[PDB]
Design a protein around this ligand. Structure first.
Ligand SMILES: CC[C@H](C)[C@H]1C(=O)N([C@H](C)c2cccc3ccccc23)C[C@@H]2N(C(=O)NCCCC(F)(F)F)CCC(=O)N12
Ligand SMILES: CC[C@H](C)[C@H]1C(=O)N([C@H](C)c2cccc3ccccc23)C[C@@H]2N(C(=O)NCCCC(F)(F)F)CCC(=O)N12
Ligand SMILES: CC[C@H](C)[C@H]1C(=O)N([C@H](C)c2cccc3ccccc23)C[C@@H]2N(C(=O)NCCCC(F)(F)F)CCC(=O)N12
Ligand SMILES: CC[C@H](C)[C@H]1C(=O)N([C@H](C)c2cccc3ccccc23)C[C@@H]2N(C(=O)NCCCC(F)(F)F)CCC(=O)N12
Ligand SMILES: CC[C@H](C)[C@H]1C(=O)N([C@H](C)c2cccc3ccccc23)C[C@@H]2N(C(=O)NCCCC(F)(F)F)CCC(=O)N12
Ligand SMILES: CC[C@H](C)[C@H]1C(=O)N([C@H](C)c2cccc3ccccc23)C[C@@H]2N(C(=O)NCCCC(F)(F)F)CCC(=O)N12
Ligand SMILES: [Mg+2]
Ligand SMILES: [Mg+2]
Ligand SMILES: [Mg+2]
Ligand SMILES: [Mg+2]
Ligand SMILES: [Mg+2]
Ligand SMILES: [Mg+2]
Ligand SMILES: [Mg+2]
Ligand SMILES: [Mg+2]
Ligand SMILES: [Mg+2]
Ligand SMILES: [Mg+2]
Lengths: 181, 182, 184, 185, 179, 177, 185, 187, 185
């Protein structure tokens, strides 16, 4: 079900510097998106890139592969939330170039604390706990820098699933504008 | 770039610019592909740098060594860049890049730990498997010592359990040379 | 399908236990060992001098469970006769050899098999090492005791248990695993 | 549905038969079944070392070593063990049928007797496969020798006749020497 | 299963055996044991074998059959519900003149079922065996019914369902018991 | 199960058919009927029926045993009698077939299956059609309804109230409190 | 599996290597893999009967008969087949490593070589088990004889050294005669 | 992982298609109806391209369906070109039957190739008369196989019957001595 | 693994279709019938007078799918030759017999099997009756057509298809299912 134009549709959008993050974030998705960002910078280091985000989130490290690549490259990466940006999806939405982070009016943004698991000996559980707590501090610190909210507020607001409308995401500082029709 | 995902594909397009993407678990298929890419790139140009991007949770030690030995065998320098995560054999390969040209992005995670395995059967079969995995660990630790400047004893202690490092800590450890700031 | 006998109602195994006969007729696991240990303890308390008879038809099983039985045999005062019927393999044959000296038997077509212990290990290199060291120590312990019980050297036992080694009743006697083959 | 009978002493039907020195081998032969039958034989000898025991056999066979537990116990005890094949005695079942006291091995007229070579398996290294092969071949020689002694047939004839599944009528089993008489009504 | 003795044990006290299931080795062993017990209790009084069974193992069925013929007491057979395959063979095996069915009971006769897998010569052995088994069954059925072996062969080629009255006409039973 | 309770009821000539009808259930109920007749050939027996039905031949084992024995067998539908269960409800002694007011009675044609060659399918079809004729004929005799009406009314699942079951002739009375 | 374009002729990476007479044995050896590698060898010799072929080996081994399909095709064709162990060559993988043209068998320094006896299975009648045992023993003799010829070690030493899993470093494989050189960086 | 090769007009072929261009057919799997249909089609194509040039049938196969095997067998005998057979790795059961079916003088094996012959395998379930029909059919199939093997090898039907009673493994050299092949190709 | 031939590029089956050869080499289901029907339609449109060749190696399958093929064969103008290679069973043998008169063949070792249709039915008595009537009518339809194609009576066809009936190529010719056995050049 992916149509061709005479390029598959996604390839055609990539030709106009549009990248589609339209799934769960895992290592494959991150590798693809990183590669696309790298390609687009090499084609033109000055023109904006557009990152569409409809994602329930996923791997934090995979998300950081994308995040760090966005910040590393020279072109501004605009982010546009369409449908849903949850968890690491909303983290990436907030990571777009300042002034160029958007959502459409009925798009949903969700923020929460990271999820994980650990099994085995007490000291193994301790290591996993310490690691996921450090990961949360890292996420919260960056979210604070990107939103203008304090680390303490971010901690409280991500304790449980916290659903935001597009307008609430703007007020929060996760995006800069809601794109009206 | 004919399709993003199935120089027709995005990875093939990057390979045209001497960029290899290690973006998965390391098994024999992945190693064979990466080895083949390294071999191809050396034949195209034996002097220009190659760039190995690493986002990997690790995997097979022997598959990892296929990649490792091919890197050291070819003439071109292979730069390594950790993005996202390099764990286990992934971090071993990160450390194996050309000296001075091993990088991580600031929020990338590096994890080191001892090798994992199994053994089943008779006592003497278990012994053989134990001796083999212990020798494999010594080989890994010795090479990691040479690549990082850390002692074998420190590497042994620090890999006893899962040990997570920030990019900056990986630099201090000697696993990479520089953190690439924006 | 375990039948009853009346003389007071007893299942057949309970009836044999009344005459100091214990039946080891399965794989050796912790349940079986606990039952057999309990039976040995009961019989010693009933009479600390009269012989006990341990029937063995077993493919072996857990080494530690086997040692629960082994140590209980050696600990109690009564002699425990061992009789191999059908098969005694692995820890089964170890228990056969552990019966009171002069009172270890097999019937003529019974099979005895000796081999090295089996096991497994999964996880980190150091975990595999610990498991390997443990199973090697367990083998040394087994071999040392088998040497003491058979009169064979530790070196011969090591060589003869490297692979599955099947013995006839008569060969088991020649080896020193039993004292006599019971002819009809 | 195993019924009870009351003599008030209550017995399941098999226990009631055991009181009259009748043992029922009515299933596949495994270690549990052998242990039970061995225990019954031992009990009956202790009750009476001179009166006959009756071993009913309706069995497709099973474990050879379990079968030998039963076989050796039969030969070891003092009482004669009569064997009666009812329904089917196959493989180790027919071996046990042939092992009853000479002159006291029977089948009912429509009972089926089947003889064949032992079955097994082996997995692993070449030398492990070799050990398993040598073992099962020795087991077959042991079975065939005893069958020769019990039937009066040569080892060579037994080898040939057990190469594949060989089904015998009760009358053919008698002619073969596996049993002594067919019990007519 | 209610108590009074469980109900089946209570019936066994009056020389009634209930074959109310598929015939396998367990069922045969139980029924054989019951027949043996009842003969020892009284070698002259009739036994009653109730049959509601879809059939099952031929060799298990023959364990029961041969035990019936071996013992001294007459074994009456009564088909209630269904007697199919080896069930109907056992119905026909009751003492002559004392084989019954209730009016709505169903009797079914058919050829034996089986399987064979492996080498050509193994398939041949299995085929020869099941054909011999069918000849043995048909011969005995002929003796018990008065029908020819050829008629039995033809009539058992496929599933053949009989009413109680048809079973009587066939010679599988002697009488239909009217209320 | 808390004599267990069912055994206690059997002592007062009450049999409980409280499940699907299969060969085990039929064998038990047949045995109970036989026992009760031998205890007393003249006193009524009471057959409680709460059953979704089941095997037709098993049902007929019960049916024929009821008609064969001397004592009257009263039937009482409590909860549900469907298919073969409603057939057995209708088989109780005339004048002594009951249901409680909220009990459900369901009648329908027999269900079955056939697989294999065309001639095997034909044999199975002929057999189940003959079985249906047998059931319908007996139901006609027990209810007073014609075979044609029974055929039409059992074509699909047909649920009846206790009162409708009485009007149909499947039972004689609805027991009011 | 990435593509490479020549300016547009498209090759996957393995096809591109095959253009330079490089065959990649990078998996378990089964019939599919053997058929592919045999076909590649046949193609390569037809293209050029004199230029060397390069067989990369990173394999845990697999089917013996599939391995022999590859082995016999290597020896049959005119071009020398160089072997290079990268990562691991175990079992039939190490047999194929040793089968490369004399003087042209290599490993990279951290590559692992493992040798052991063949593995198998057998189930069924005693005589079937015997046939399977005889077959796997003959297969082992065949493997060991060829390994002796290729390494210079005696058949007796090969038998002893393959009794259990025997892991060798690249340097030890050279000393053993399984390869001719370790390629140092 | 089936590789591509590009000829110099340029043409792209998978490796098997490239071999087919030189009249080489690869029987490299279990023999079922799909495999037989493909091989039959290849034989038919090659005969139409050239009715006189030899065809080469590579055999590495554990065997499989007898009727599928006979589809291949009969097509080999029907076409005009000689079909050479070469056993590489293993030819077992119907695989070894097809090996023996190659043109006389042009049946080969490489030295370490394994050849196995045995009686056909099957199954039957159901009524006694159904089992009988299946038994008769598989016995007739065995007679047919054995008769043809006798004609192809020069061995008697009686010897073939005895030698295929159980799994019988042959070296390439033993297969030649048996008459299943004509030559072992030595390096 | 369906190979390519270059004139554009054709898979092997497409190449044969260019020469008016259709390969029925599987179980007959709706997909297979649709493909074969489409091929027949294509070939008639290409040339309404030249023969078509239908190779048949099939265990049979769906009767209605088989009739899709059958009716399309009879509807089109070109003669459709049928050639049985390997096996034609059930609906496969029905289609073999449906080829143009005088142009139905089998190779000498090909197997032909005829039997009655198979099916199933579940549910209410009247549903079972409907399914039984339907499959019986389907059998009458098949037998009538087979009678017309073979020259055998409907009564003989009924008797001969009661159970699985295996025919040699020569027996199929004698029966009238085919016209000739193609013997080797
Ligand atoms: C055949 C037995 C011969 C009379 C003898 C013997 O060989 N064994 C051996 C040691 C034995 C032990 C355990 C299980 C056996 C099973 C079969 C044969 C001998 C067994 C035990 C046996 N003993 C008993 O049989 N005691 C009576 C037990 C009665 C009952 F419990 F009901 F079984 C101990 C004294 C003895 O002389 N023997
Ligand atoms: C019908 C039996 C004929 C009178 C005879 C006989 O043939 N057998 C054979 C050998 C036999 C043994 C075991 C199981 C049998 C089952 C069915 C038929 C004979 C069987 C044993 C049988 N015996 C008994 O039946 N003893 C009483 C047991 C009664 C109870 F235990 F309650 F079942 C021993 C004395 C004897 O004369 N016979
Ligand atoms: C009023 C005709 C009856 C019932 C008659 C009869 O027909 N049968 C037949 C043969 C029978 C046997 C087995 C199961 C039966 C089930 C239902 C009906 C008859 C059955 C058995 C029945 N018999 C008994 O009922 N004995 C009393 C003990 C019964 C119990 F309490 F259950 F133990 C034996 C002889 C007899 O006269 N009949
Ligand atoms: C690093 C390679 C060194 C320069 C050398 C070598 O060591 N090998 C070995 C034998 C080799 C073979 C097969 C796979 C290998 C993989 C990694 C390293 C060496 C390999 C073969 C290798 N050769 C090539 O690399 N040819 C060009 C292949 C181009 C393309 F196909 F695109 F990859 C042959 C001539 C040679 O000098 N070498
Ligand atoms: C140059 C000696 C060979 C190797 C010789 C040979 O032994 N075989 C045998 C019969 C053969 C057939 C099929 C597959 C084989 C695979 C491996 C070895 C021999 C094979 C056929 C082989 N032939 C070819 O190699 N033709 C060219 C192949 C081109 C391409 F398709 F590209 F692979 C036919 C002429 C011939 O002399 N031989
Ligand atoms: C045998 C066909 C007879 C000549 C005729 C016909 O009966 N049909 C019917 C309606 C038809 C339609 C769709 C599928 C059919 C499949 C089999 C037979 C008839 C079919 C349509 C069919 N038509 C075509 O066959 N057109 C050319 C075919 C194109 C291609 F297949 F690609 F080559 C349209 C006009 C016409 O004359 N007919
Ligand atoms: Mg940027
Ligand atoms: Mg380098
Ligand atoms: Mg003691
Ligand atoms: Mg005795
Ligand atoms: Mg009698
Ligand atoms: Mg009444
Ligand atoms: Mg060569
Ligand atoms: Mg070593
Ligand atoms: Mg030819
Ligand atoms: Mg036409």
């Amino acid at each position: 079900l992916i149509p061709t134009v005479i390029y598959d549709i996604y390839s055609r959008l990539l030709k106009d510097r549009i990248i589609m993050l339209g799934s769960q974030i895992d290592d494959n998705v991150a590798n693809s998106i990183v590669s696309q960002l790298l390609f687009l910078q090499a084609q033109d280091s000055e023109k904006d890139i557009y990152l569409y985000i409809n994602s329930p989130g996923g791997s934090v490290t995979a998300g950081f592969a994308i995040y760090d690549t966005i910040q590393h490259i020279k072109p501004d990466v605009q982010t546009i939330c369409i449908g849903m940006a949850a968890s690491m999806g909303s983290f990436l939405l907030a990571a777009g170039a300042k002034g160029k982070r958007f959502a459409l009016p009925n798009a949903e943004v969700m923020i929460h604390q990271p999820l994980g698991g650990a099994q085995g000996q007490a000291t193994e559980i301790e290591i996993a706990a310490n690691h996921i707590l450090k990961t949360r501090e890292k996420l919260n610190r960056i979210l604070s820098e990107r939103t203008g909210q304090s680390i303490e507020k971010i901690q409280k607001d991500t304790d449980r699933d916290n659903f935001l409308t597009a307008e609430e995401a703007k007020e929060y500082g996760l995006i800069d504008e809601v794109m009206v029709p």
